[PDB]
Design a protein around this ligand. Sequence first.
Ligand code: J2A
Lengths: 195, 195
Amino acid sequence: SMAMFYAHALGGYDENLHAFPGISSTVANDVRKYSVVSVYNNKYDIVKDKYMWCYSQVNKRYIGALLPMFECNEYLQIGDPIHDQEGNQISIITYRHKNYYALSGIGYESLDLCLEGVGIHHHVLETGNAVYGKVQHDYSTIKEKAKEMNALSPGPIIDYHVWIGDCICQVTAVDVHGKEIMRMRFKKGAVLPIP
Amino acid sequence: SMAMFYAHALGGYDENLHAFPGISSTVANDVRKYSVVSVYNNKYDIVKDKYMWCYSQVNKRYIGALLPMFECNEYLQIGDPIHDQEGNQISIITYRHKNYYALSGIGYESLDLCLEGVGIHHHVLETGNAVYGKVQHDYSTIKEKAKEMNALSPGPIIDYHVWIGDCICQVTAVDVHGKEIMRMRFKKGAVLPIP
Ligand SMILES: Nc1nc(=O)c2ncn([C@@H]3O[C@@H]4CO[P@](=O)(S)O[C@H]5[C@@H](O)[C@H](n6cnc7c(N)ncnc76)O[C@@H]5CO[P@@](=O)(S)O[C@@H]3[C@@H]4O)c2[nH]1
């Protein structure tokens, strides 16, 4: 049947369709392979070695991922179809960070969460800072806190924290005492969308 | 260049572009002439003798008009193109009332307002009700109300009221005491959009 793309920001979420940041679609496009995309007969270049952390929270389901992004100085509307050079539609306009536009679909490192009972928060990780739990600081302070919190018994996860830095991205999970229960690292630099 | 359509609901109002209910566009399409439209390669019939009163409030400027509307049980997303039989985009999805979708552009009777210092309010005119000023009731109550308010000295207009009924549409303008200062009547039946 027809390849549909519904934007989550317009209420288009369908659990029976493939779900990506800001997109429910009938087909699952791998957008990692493209270096140039087109929007209304206009070609744009995919940014190399810099990505955009994009997420959408629908019902109690978090859908986050590191996505490719292309630069475009003109204003492009949410829902605008994105094509490849062969005429195929591969995505729609979703998220934006100044002159950068995310390319949503099957991308790079991703995170999916049941948000029932837990929260999630997003931070810009300042360069040079380490991360423990729900805080970011210099290595010495983070290191000493990790040893301090080490003597505590782990409680249940209550919050997730996403840290988006220019060279690394990390996700931590904390209990009620701020103790780090879990930590993932994505070895990519990225930016967050500007609403 | 290429014919562009921007949905007002997505922040795409441009005062230098043609402005219609929910649409800023580089072209001004007269949509009264169409009896069928197509969305996602599906043909839909324009309803005959019933319209939709659509409006958007952008830049303290009110833009309202009776628009043609077509019946579609499927879900169509705001901003998606509307085509004619020849494949040309003539409009975008804007407003909806259950299984009816507006066809915005140059439509039928219209109302433009400068919304600074004056208000506007929309009402469904219940069948059999009469209207005075900012209120609707049965004809007996309205007759008495009109007599009472006749004795009042008129003041400057501060509010507009749009009455959309199955047989007729009317706009009244009231002063601070609710006296009717102006009334226009459109000899068409219509419905209001449902968000
Ligand atoms: N190992 C590792 N793998 C990578 O892939 C990686 N990428 C970048 N870096 C950075 O290199 C520096 C040295 O790492 P490290 O010395 S092992 O210190 C880590 C951790 O051991 C410490 N910590 C957490 N929990 C406990 C606990 N229960 N007890 C004791 N210590 C704990 O908290 C610190 C968090 O710092 P961060 O990870 S955000 O940045 C790192 C540091 O700045 C990486 N490090």
